[PDB]
C-alpha cells in the first residue's frame, strides 16, 4: 500500500516540527522592514580580505590536508590555540561544527526519553531544539537580569536530579542577563553539592561592554578541582557564524563520549574552516576582540537611548551589559503575537518570547536584537516599534 | 560520577576499531590498506585556492554570514541538474555522514527495526546504532544483497527503512545488477517501505556506464519511498564535508528540521567553493577519477593474484575503492592483523562492518591512497603475512 510519511517517521520526527518560529521569522524580512528578530552577528566585522588571503595560502600550500579526511577531535593547531586561550590542555578540546552541534552531541550522550534536563526560562532556541530531540522532561527556573533564580533552583534540585544544567552565564540569550560573580559561586556550590553536570554556553564570552569579563563556571569550577562543567565556546560571534567552527571543553571521560558522538554526526568539522579560523586568530586576536566590543557596545547604547524616548515606561526592557539582546516585557495580559502583527504594519519586527520557553510561556515578552542594524536603523526601528507598541496599549 | 551520569545513547557509541586501533597503522614505515581515504592526487589544489580566495573577496558577506539550512541555491540547482531532479528536492548536508544521522533521528526509535546488509558501511551502523534500533541484516555478495534472505525477512519483519549501497558497496565492492534492483524495488513498493540509497560511489565505475539508481527506477515507477544520498567526498574533496540528500518533499522537511538542530546549516563557504569548482568541466574531472581508481584497482588485483594464496579469497570490484578479503572460516583476520604488522602492512578487520557481530575471518582493503609501488609492495607484505597464517 501507499506511503504515509506522517507515520513512516519515528517519535523524534515529532519533537522537531519548528513550524511557527519559521512562518513568523519569514513574515519579516520583506520590503522596507527594519527587523530586530534573528541573531545575525554584525556583518561589517567579517574579515573578508584576509580570509580570502588565508584561504588561498592554505589551500595552495596545504591543500592535501584541508581537502582530505581529517581527525575527529579537530585540527591540531586550532585545538592548541583554543587550549592556550581558554586555559587547558589540547586533549580537553573538541572542535565542533558550531556550538549547535556540541549542543546536539551533549543531548545525545546525556539525555534519554523522559530524562530530567535543567535550563532557564526563557533560553536559547538552539539548546531547546537540540535537547527536545531527545524527548526529555524540561525542568526550569526563571531568569532575570541577575542570571537564574538560584533559590527556585535549589528547590528544583532537591526534588529532582537533572542529567545536567544548561546555563548561559554571560549575556544569556534571549534576556541578555548577566550572572554576578557571587551568584556564580553559589551556583557552583549547589552543583558540587550534588555532583551535577553543568553545560556552560559562553558564546558571548568576549562581548562584555564592561572593563572586563567575569570568570566562568568552568574557570571557577576548575580552580576548585571539580570537573563536572562542560564549556562550549564558539567563533560565530567574534569571527564568522557562517564558518561553522566551535568547540567543547570538558573532562576526558565526557570528552571521549562527545568525540564518538561527533564522529557519527559528521565524521569531522571541515578542515579548511578549522585552519582558516586559526590563520586569523593567531594574528591580532586581541585587537579583533577589542574591535568587536566597541561595535556592539555602540549599537547597544543606541538601542537603549531610542527605547527610552519612544517606549512608554508601562513596559520594561533590560539594559544589556554585553551581547546583542534586549529582552522586552509588555504589561501582563498583553500578547506579543498581537504586538508582532501590529509591528509589521509599522514595518518593524522582533521575535515573540514564546519560542524561548522550553515548556511554553512568555506570552507577553519578546526579544530584540540590535547587532545587524545601523545607529539609524536602530533608532528608526525603535520609533516604529514604540509606535506600534503604543497602538497595542488600549 | 561520569559513567553514572550519561545516557543510553552513550553506550550505543563506544568507538572501538576507529579511534583506538588506527594508531598502530601509522608508525614509522608501514604501508596501510586500512582507512577509506580518497586519492589526494585528485584534489584541485590551485583551482580551489583561486575560487575560495575569490568567494571571500567578492561575496564574502554571504559566505561568512549564517545561511538558511537547505543550502546555497546554486549548489542545489547544480545537484538537481546532475541527479535529474528539482532544486526543492535537494537537501545539502555536511557530508553523507550527516544525512545518515538525520535519517536515523527521523525514522528510528529504540527498538525500531532497521534493515541493512551484513556487512555494510560502518558509518551507517554508527549513525543508526545511536538510536538503539534492532538490526536486521541480510548477507551481501558480489551481486549485492541476498534478495531471497530479504523477502524472507520482509515476510516477518517490517524495517523502518532499508539501507543499501547498490553501487560498489563499502566494504565489499559488490555491484547490484539492474535486474536485482528491479526486484528489490518491486519488494519495497509492494510493502510501502523506505529505502535509504547511499551513492557515494555513483561516479566511480570502472566500466563505461553507471547503473540505474534505485532512486531512478523508483521515481520512474512513481514510488516516493527512496531517500537518495549523494556525496562530494569521493569526486572532489572528502574534507570539505559537502554532500546532499534527495528525497520526497514531506520527508525532506523533517530532514531539514532535523539538520538545523544538528549544525544550523552546512558551512556556506564550503558549499559555494564546491559549486565554483564544479560549474566547470565536471565530466572531465569525473573521468580523471574513474581512471585513477580503475588504474589503481587493476594494480591491486594483479598484486593480489601474484601474492595471495589460493586458500584465501578476495572480491574483484567493478568500481569503488575497496577489496574485501575473507580467510577460510575459523582463521582470524584480527590475528592476521598482528602478523601483518610484523610485515609492516595493515588493513581493517571486518568485525565492525557487521551490525550484529560475526565475520571475524574477513577484512577490508583500501588502495586509493597508495600508488603503483605501494600497492605492489604492500600486497607483497600482505601476501607474506598470509603465508604465515596459512603456516598453521
Ligand atoms: C549565537 C549563539 C551560539 C553560536 O552558535 P553556533 O552554532 O556556534 O554558531 C551559541 N549559543 C548561544 C546562546 C548563542 O546565542
Ligand atoms: C565515503 C562514503 C560516504 C561519504 O561520506 P561523507 O560524509 O560524504 O564523507 C557515504 N557512504 C559510503 C558507503 C562511503 O564509503
- Per the listing, cell 545537484 goes with B79
Kindly give, in sequence order, each residue whose CB lies less than 8 Å from that of residue B17, ignoring residues fewer than 6 positions away. B348, B349, B351, B352
Cβ pair A120, A167 in contact under 8 A: yes
Tell me which fold the domain B1-64+282-392 belongs to.
Answer: 3.90.1150
Kindly give, in sequence order, each residue whose CB lies less than 8 Å from that of residue A75, ignoring residues fewer than 6 positions away. A95, A269, A271, A274, A275, A278
3-state DSSP assignment of residue B218? helix
Ligand 1 atom at shortest distance from the alpha carbon of A96: 8
Cβ pair B249, B89 in contact under 8 A: yes
A236 lines ligand 1 (CB under 6 A): yes
Spatial separation of the C-alpha atoms in residues B138 and A107, rounded to whole Å: 32
Domain borders along chain B are 1-64+282-392, 65-281
Beta-sheet pairing, B162-164 with B195-198: parallel
Spell out the long-range contacts of A56-62 with Cβ–Cβ below 8 A and sequence spacing 24 or more: A56/B49, A56/B50, A56/B52, A56/B53, A57/A279, A57/B49, A58/A272, A58/A275, A58/A276, A58/A279, A58/B49, A59/A272, A59/B45, A59/B48, A59/B49, A59/B52, A60/B45, A60/B46, A60/B49, A62/A275
Spatial separation of the C-alpha atoms in residues A262 and B15, rounded to whole Å: 11
CA A74 to chain centre: 22
Phi, psi of B326 (to 5 degrees): -135, 115
**Nearest Cα residue to atom 14 of ligand 2:** B200
The yes/no answer on whether domain A68-284 falls in CATH 3.30.230.70 is: no
Ligand nearest to the CA of B64: 1
CA B287 to chain centre: 20
Spatial separation of the C-alpha atoms in residues A29 and B68, rounded to whole Å: 13
End-to-end CA distance of chain A: 56
Spatial separation of the C-alpha atoms in residues B317 and B297, rounded to whole Å: 8
3-state DSSP assignment of residue B261? helix
Beta-sheet pairing, B31-32 with A365-369: unpaired
Cβ pair B230, B78 in contact under 8 A: no
> A66-97 as b/e, with b when 16 or more CB fall inside 10 Å?
bbbbbebbbbeebbebbbeebebebebbbbbb
Instruction: Look up the CATH number of domain B65-281.
Output: 3.40.640.10
CA of B176 to the centre of ligand 1 (A): 44
Beta-sheet pairing, B162-164 with B144-145: unpaired
Instruction: Give the residue from A280, A218, A220 showing the smallest Cα distance to A250.
Output: A218
> What count of CB pairs under 8 Å joins A to B?
267
Spatial separation of the C-alpha atoms in residues B134 and B137, rounded to whole Å: 10
Peptide bond into B98 cis (omega under 30): no
Best mutation site among B38, B170, B262, B353 for ligand 2 pocket (most ligand atoms within 8 Å of CB): B170
Spatial separation of the C-alpha atoms in residues B201 and A85, rounded to whole Å: 41
CA of B41 to the centre of ligand 2 (A): 18
Cβ pair A161, A191 in contact under 8 A: no
3-state DSSP assignment of residue B230? strand
Smallest CA–CA distance, residue A237 to chain B, in Å, is: 10
End-to-end CA distance of chain B: 47
Interchain CB distance below 8 Å, A129 and B269? no
Cβ pair B17, B125 in contact under 8 A: no
Cβ pair B341, B335 in contact under 8 A: no
Virtual torsion, Cα A73, B6, A123, A21, nearest 10 deg = 80
Cβ pair A392, A350 in contact under 8 A: no
Cβ pair A95, A246 in contact under 8 A: yes
- Establish whether domains A1-67+285-394 and A68-284 are of one fold: no
Beta-sheet pairing, B322-326 with B313-314: antiparallel
Phi, psi of A136 (to 5 degrees): -85, 180
Residue A196, beta-bridge partner list: none
Spatial separation of the C-alpha atoms in residues B84 and A254, rounded to whole Å: 44
Question: Within 10 Å of residue B74's Cβ, how many Cβ atoms?
Answer: 14
Beta-sheet pairing, A351-352 with A365-369: antiparallel
C-alpha dist (Å) from residue A52 to A56, A62, A66, A70, B71: 6, 15, 15, 22, 21
Virtual torsion, Cα B125, B4, A269, B117, nearest 10 deg = 0
Cβ pair A47, A39 in contact under 8 A: no
C-alpha dist (Å) from residue B95 to B29, B100, B115: 31, 9, 22
- Per the listing, cell 541577575 goes with A146
Resolution of the structure, angstroms: 2.7
3-state secondary structure chain A: CCCCHHHHCCCHHHHHCCCCCCCHHHHCCCCCCEECCCCCCCHHHCCHHHHHHHHHHHHHHHHHHHCCCCCCCCCHHHHHHHHHHHCCCHHHEEEECCHHHHHHHHHHHHCCCCCEEEEEECCCHHHHHHHHCCCCEEEEEEEECCEECHHHHHHHHHHCCCCCEEECCECCCCCCCECCHHHHHHHHHHHHCCCCCEEEECCCCCCECCCCCCCCHHHHHHCCCCCCEEEEEECCCCCCCCCCCEEEECCHHHHHHHHHHHHHHHCCCCHHHHHHHHHHHCCCHHHHHHHHHHHHHHHHHHHHHHHHHHCCCCCEECCCCECCEEEEECCCCCCHHHHHHHHHHCCEECEECHHHCCCCCCCCEEEEECCCCCHHHHHHHHHHHHHHHHHHCC
Instruction: Give the residue from B247, B253, B217 showing the smallest Cα distance to B230.
Output: B247
Cβ pair B75, B275 in contact under 8 A: yes
Spatial separation of the C-alpha atoms in residues A291 and A47, rounded to whole Å: 12
Ligand 2 atom at shortest distance from the alpha carbon of B97: 7
What DSSP state is assigned to residue B23?
G
Locate A251 and state its grid cell.
Answer: 573532562
C-alpha dist (Å) from residue A135 to A112, A115, A225, B317: 7, 8, 32, 44
Spatial separation of the C-alpha atoms in residues A209 and A170, rounded to whole Å: 11
Peptide bond into B119 cis (omega under 30): yes
Interchain CB distance below 8 Å, B263 and A49? no
Interchain CB distance below 8 Å, B7 and A115? yes
Per-residue DSSP letters for B149-212? HHHHHHTT---S-EEE--BS-TTT--B--HHHHHHHHHHHHHTT--EEEE-TTTT-BSSS----
- Per the listing, cell 578476495 goes with B314
Cβ pair A70, A271 in contact under 8 A: yes
Spatial separation of the C-alpha atoms in residues B372 and B384, rounded to whole Å: 18
Locate A329 and state its grid cell.
Answer: 516585557
Spell out the long-range contacts of A300-306 with Cβ–Cβ below 8 A and sequence spacing 24 or more: A300/A209, A300/A324, A300/A370, A302/A370, A302/A375, A302/A378, A302/A379, A303/A368, A303/A370, A303/A378, A303/A382, A306/A378, A306/A379, A306/A381, A306/A382, A306/A383
Angle at B287 between CA B282 and CA B292, to 5 degrees: 130
Phi-psi region for residue B362, left (φ > 0), alpha (ψ -120 to 50) or beta? beta
Beta-sheet pairing, B322-326 with B31-32: unpaired
Q: Which of B53, B239, B264 faces A270 most closely, judged by CB atoms?
A: B239
Spatial separation of the C-alpha atoms in residues B308 and A60, rounded to whole Å: 40
Kindly give, in sequence order, each residue whose CB lies less than 8 Å from that of residue B239, ignoring residues fewer than 6 positions away. A65, A66, A67, A68, A69, A70, A268, A270, A271, A272
Phi-psi region for residue A193, left (φ > 0), alpha (ψ -120 to 50) or beta? alpha
Sign of the torsion formed by the C-alpha atoms of A133, A252, A247 and A65: negative
Instruction: Look up the CATH number of domain A1-67+285-394.
Output: 3.90.1150.10
Is A226 one of the annotated binding-site residues? no
Residue B144, beta-bridge partner list: B141
Burial (Cβ within 10 Å: 0-12, 13-18, ≥19) of residue B262: buried
Question: Within 10 Å of residue B171's Cβ, how many Cβ atoms?
Answer: 27
Interchain CB distance below 8 Å, B66 and A272? no
- Per the listing, cell 551481486 goes with B143
Spatial separation of the C-alpha atoms in residues A264 and B98, rounded to whole Å: 8
Residue B140, beta-bridge partner list: B145
3-state DSSP assignment of residue B213? coil
CA of B136 to the centre of ligand 2 (A): 21
- Per the listing, cell 601509522 goes with B26
Q: Which method resolved this structure?
A: X-ray
3-state DSSP assignment of residue B115? strand
3-state DSSP assignment of residue B312? coil
Kindly give, in sequence order, each residue whose CB lies less than 8 Å from that of residue B190, ignoring residues fewer than 6 positions away. none
Locate A69 and state its grid cell.
Answer: 579526511
Q: Longest C-alpha distance within chain B, in Å?
A: 66
B238 lines ligand 2 (CB under 6 A): yes
Spatial separation of the C-alpha atoms in residues A264 and B97, rounded to whole Å: 7
Cβ pair A370, A303 in contact under 8 A: yes
Angle at B12 between CA B7 and CA B16, to 5 degrees: 125
3-state DSSP assignment of residue B41? helix
The kind and range of the H/E element at B135 are: strand B134-141
Spatial separation of the C-alpha atoms in residues B4 and A54, rounded to whole Å: 45
3-state DSSP assignment of residue B346? strand
Amino acid at each position: 500500500k501507499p506511503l504515509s510519511w506522517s507515520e513512516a517517521f519515528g517519535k523524534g520526527a515529532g519533537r522537531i516540527q519548528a513550524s511557527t518560529i519559521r512562518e513568523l521569522l519569514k513574515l519579516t524580512q520583506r520590503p522596507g522592514i527594519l527587523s530586530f528578530a534573528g541573531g545575525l552577528p554584525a556583518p561589517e566585522l567579517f574579515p573578508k580580505e584576509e580570509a580570502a588571503e588565508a584561504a588561498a595560502r592554505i589551500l595552495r600550500e596545504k591543500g592535501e590536508v584541508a581537502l582530505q579526511y581529517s581527525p575527529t577531535e579537530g585540527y591540531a593547531p586550532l585545538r592548541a590555540f583554543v587550549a592556550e586561550w581558554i586555559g587547558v590542555r589540547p586533549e580537553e578540546v573538541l572542535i565542533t561544527t558550531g556550538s549547535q552541534q556540541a549542543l546536539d552531541l551533549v543531548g545525545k550522550v546525556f539525555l534519554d526519553e523522559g530524562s530530567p534536563v535543567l535550563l532557564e526560562a526563557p533560553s536559547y532556541m538552539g539548546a531547546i531544539q537540540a535537547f527536545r530531540l531527545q524527548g526529555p522532561r524540561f525542568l526550569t527556573v526563571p531568569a532575570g537580569e541577575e542570571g537564574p533564580d538560584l533559590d527556585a533552583l535549589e528547590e528544583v534540585l532537591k526534588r529532582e536530579r537533572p542529567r545536567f544544567l544548561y546555563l548561559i552565564p554571560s549575556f544569556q540569550n534571549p534576556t541578555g542577563g548577566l550572572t554576578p560573580l557571587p551568584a556564580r559561586k553559589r551556583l557552583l556550590q549547589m552543583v558540587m553539592e550534588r555532583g551535577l553536570v553543568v553545560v556552560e554556553d559562553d558564546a558571548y564570552r568576549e562581548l562584555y561592554f564592561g572593563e572586563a569579563r567575569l570568570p566562568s563556571l568552568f574557570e571557577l569550577a576548575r580552580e576548585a578541582g571539580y570537573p563536572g562543567v562542560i564549556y562550549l565556546g564558539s567563533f560565530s560571534k567574534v569571527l564568522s557564524p557562517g564558518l561553522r567552527v566551535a568547540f567543547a571543553v570538558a573532562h576526558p571521560e565526557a570528552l571521549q563520549k562527545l568525540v564518538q558522538a561527533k564522529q557519527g554526526a559528521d565524521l569531522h568539522t571541515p578542515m579548511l574552516n578549522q585552519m582558516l579560523v586559526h590563520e586569523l586568530l593567531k594574528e591580532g586576536f586581541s585587537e579583533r576582540l577589542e574591535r568587536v566590543r566597541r561595535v556592539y557596545r555602540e549599537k547597544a547604547q543606541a538601542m537603549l537611548h531610542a527605547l527610552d524616548r519612544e517606549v512608554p515606561k508601562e513596559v520594561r526592557y533590560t539594559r544589556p551589559k554585553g551581547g546583542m539582546f534586549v529582552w522586552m516585557e509588555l504589561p501582563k495580559g498583553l500578547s506579543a503575537e498581537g504586538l508582532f502583527r501590529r509591528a509589521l504594519e509599522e514595518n518593524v519586527a522582533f521575535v515573540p518570547g514564546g519560542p524561548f520557553f522550553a515548556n511554553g510561556g512568555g506570552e507577553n515578552t519578546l526579544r530584540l536584537s540590535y547587532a545587524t542594524l545601523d545607529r539609524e536603523g536602530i533608532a528608526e526601528g525603535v520609533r516604529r516599534l514604540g509606535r506600534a507598541l503604543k497602538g497595542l496599549l488600549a
